[PDB]
Amino acid sequence: NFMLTQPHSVSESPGKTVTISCTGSSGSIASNYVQWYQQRPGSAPTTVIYEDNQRPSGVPDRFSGSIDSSSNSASLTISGLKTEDEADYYCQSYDSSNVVFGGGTKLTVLGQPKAAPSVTLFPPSSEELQANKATLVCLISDFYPGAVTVAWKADSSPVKAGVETTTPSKQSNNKYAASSYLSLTPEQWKSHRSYSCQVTHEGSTVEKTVAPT
Amino acid sequence: QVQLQESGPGLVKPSETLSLTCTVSGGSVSSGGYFWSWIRQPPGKGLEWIGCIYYSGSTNYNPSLKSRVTISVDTSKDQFSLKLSSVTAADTAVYYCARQLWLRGRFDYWGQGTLVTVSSASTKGPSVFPLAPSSKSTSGGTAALGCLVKDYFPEPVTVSWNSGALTSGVHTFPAVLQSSGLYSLSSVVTVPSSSLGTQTYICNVNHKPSNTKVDKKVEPKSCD
Amino acid sequence: FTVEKGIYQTSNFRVQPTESIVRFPNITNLCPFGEVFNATRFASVYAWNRKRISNCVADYSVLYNSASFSTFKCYGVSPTKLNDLCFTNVYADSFVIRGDEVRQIAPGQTGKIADYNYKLPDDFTGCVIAWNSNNLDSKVGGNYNYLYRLFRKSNLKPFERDISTEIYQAGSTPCNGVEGFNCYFPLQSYGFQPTNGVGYQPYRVVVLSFELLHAPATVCGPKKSTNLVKNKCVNFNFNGLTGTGVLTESNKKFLPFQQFGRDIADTTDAVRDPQTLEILDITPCSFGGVSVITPGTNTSNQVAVLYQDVNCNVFQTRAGCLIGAEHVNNSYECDIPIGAGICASYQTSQSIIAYTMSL
Ligand SMILES: *[C@@H]1O[C@H](CO)[C@@H](O)[C@H](O)[C@H]1NC(C)=O
Ligand SMILES: *[C@@H]1O[C@H](CO)[C@@H](O)[C@H](O)[C@H]1NC(C)=O
Ligand SMILES: *[C@@H]1O[C@H](CO)[C@@H](O)[C@H](O)[C@H]1NC(C)=O
Ligand SMILES: *[C@@H]1O[C@H](CO)[C@@H](O)[C@H](O)[C@H]1NC(C)=O
């Protein structure tokens, strides 16, 4: 029942010094060796320290680790933060024949200003209608911050059944992109006079509408 | 040096048996007196230790993963494989085969992580539908058009415009789980409205696991 | 710039070795050392067992793959690279301690045990191996057989044992060794119990320090055994010398107590293989230098290269190896001497030939 406690979110501006902790609950932190792993997103983790004070060949000298055994906490000191340091940090232990990892630390740095979400609405196609299906697609693009709330409308009544939306994702031009999909029956598409998708972004609302034509 | 490469299918059905084998090149399994271990990592979550093996029959497993991890070493093929039983939807994690020099110490060499997805459906092809631009689809001097990919299994699906000739303004969105099992996404491109009726735009959606390639032309909406 | 007919020595031919095979041991063994980690009973911290190991092959891989030690601490040297590194002596300091005092056993920590029983210096390069064996050294009803020290007058030197049973004095009034006022006994009994938790059970803590002085390696890690190669110029190191040469099959046996073999000229040219008790000879490869046969200025341009004492267009003469001059069975009067009764000359186009000289 030994678990390593790590700060979930840690942020610091480049060039300063930050300390990442790793606290053990039951077992003492000087009992077993502690290994810190720095893992890039979409990449294999790499060992950046070993034996709790020794840096492997290849990593910079700044990856310095210290042990505070009185508080049962393992510390990893980072000096001179850079761009490439933004990665997940995990601390490792062994306990007793059962390797236990840490919670995880997300080294943060502190690039697009507020951007308006261009909105486009697409009606269902005739080929989809011949397949006894219908889908309303709302597109959300070129916006910042990456937090947009969508709300489908059937003329005036809000629509929630069959609504599928995507989390915002960063674009190539530093902005964000998102989408919303409204699964619908062919009968329900023509039952209402018009359908609309409303996008709320930083208070401002951008609305498009479509009709069966 | 030495390297660690994983194999096995990237998909597994619920309540089934997982078969992932990690092979070794540039070294020997039995020689050197080192260990092997399997470590998984869910997307957005921390690393989880599964178990460790020696070149002999010595095995130790995580208490939360006990009585379900079966790992064996075949020195003839210079590889070791892990078998998992009763896989659920919460077992979706990136499996890493890492070499371990010290049993209490670092995993010095990490293999590239294969993606394992557990879903409950039959592998089905995608349904590509055209996304017709119109007067309500343009805001200013530019318009938008795309293609809809709905009701497919599994990820990933690649969409290319004009056989990759059109890349500027193309936005491929990540998939989202539908209300019933399957996924859905779309790929759209922003274009000036002057070339709507004079240029042909064809989307190429490919689904390799189902072996389906669909080319769908995009045309402006015709009122009927 | 003008070269006349004759033999000219330019350089020497060197046969550089291509492989380096070294094999000290044949197998792996260990002296009785696990008995102190598996004894019937242990000792206290006021008087701990001290073990010295001398002239004994010993691997630390067996002492690690037990998968039963709860804790493990070794500073000064990496755990995976300590076997091949060789020291002089290993000191084993075995004692018992509670679960809340394994934390204080580290270089640079204070407390009541690490300062009154065993002080760890800053330059501590040993390993600490500790594990739980509460099912043998504890019993119901109260196991008080283990002792520890609580009071001390002042600090104590590292690697020093104190067994003083004198009553510690806190004030200025003597007590004459009674259980009176302003004095207390320094030695106190433990509180071990088999039904304890995870922080007060008796743990076995051992310390394995290393000795570094002007002495050769006595007890350390052995080496691996490579493949045996013969009849090739291969460098070897068989326990006394790093010699390069061929290893031929000898026909002379040694007495079953020797390892080396010398000759009349006092050169080690025979060593018994420790792997299979095979007697192998040693012979150097690089013999002599090179020589060049030149027909002369304004006669020819091509030359012939002669090796002095090297065994191999190409003619194997009795005076080494001759390349670049064909051999002809007839005999004329010779002009450019080579040795062993065969000369070389430039005759009939026309090329350099070698023949036995005519008297
Ligand atoms: C070393 O061990 C091998 C295998 O056990 C044996 O064949 C050889 O004779 C041994 N050499 C000795 C004891 O010198
Ligand atoms: C002590 O003895 C037990 C049982 O005889 C054995 O399993 C163990 O390896 C020995 N050594 C240690 C360090 O426990
Ligand atoms: C020279 O070497 C060859 C092959 O290694 C061997 O057959 C020959 O006997 C050698 N010459 C002498 C004089 O030993
Ligand atoms: C030279 O002549 C003798 C005569 O029998 C013959 O044996 C030998 O092979 C000849 N050598 C050459 C190089 O022709």
Residue numbers in the entry:
A (entry chain F): 1 to 110, 118 to 220
B (entry chain J): 1 to 224
C (entry chain B): 306 to 617, 641 to 676, 689 to 699
What did the article's authors report about this structure?
During the first 3 years of the pandemic, the spike (S) protein on the virus surface has been actively undergoing antigenic drift generating a large number of variants. Being a highly dynamic protein, SARS-CoV-2 S-protein has been observed to adopt RBD “up” and “down” conformations. Our structural study reveals that interactions between the VL6-57-encoded mAbs and RBD are mainly mediated by germline gene encoded residues in HCDR3 and LCDR1, while germline gene encoded LCDR3 residues support HCDR3 in antigen binding. We provide evidence to suggest that the identified class of antibodies constitute a potential immune pressure driving the genesis of S371L/F-S373P-S375F mutations in Omicron variants.
BLI assays confirmed that all of the 5 recombinant mAbs are able to bind to wildtype SARS-CoV-2 RBD with affinities (KD) in the range of 30-1504 nM. Notably, H18 exhibits detectable cross-reactivities with RBDs of SARS-CoV-1, Bat CoV RaTG13, and Pangolin CoV GD1, with affinities ranging between 134–332 nM. H18 has mild neutralization activity towards wildtype, Alpha, Beta and Delta SARS-CoV-2 authentic viruses, it also possesses activity to trigger conformational change of SARS-CoV-2 S and exhibits inhibition activity in the S-protein-ACE2 interaction mediated cell-cell membrane fusion assay. Unfortunately, we were not able to uncover high-resolution information on the H18 epitope from these structures.
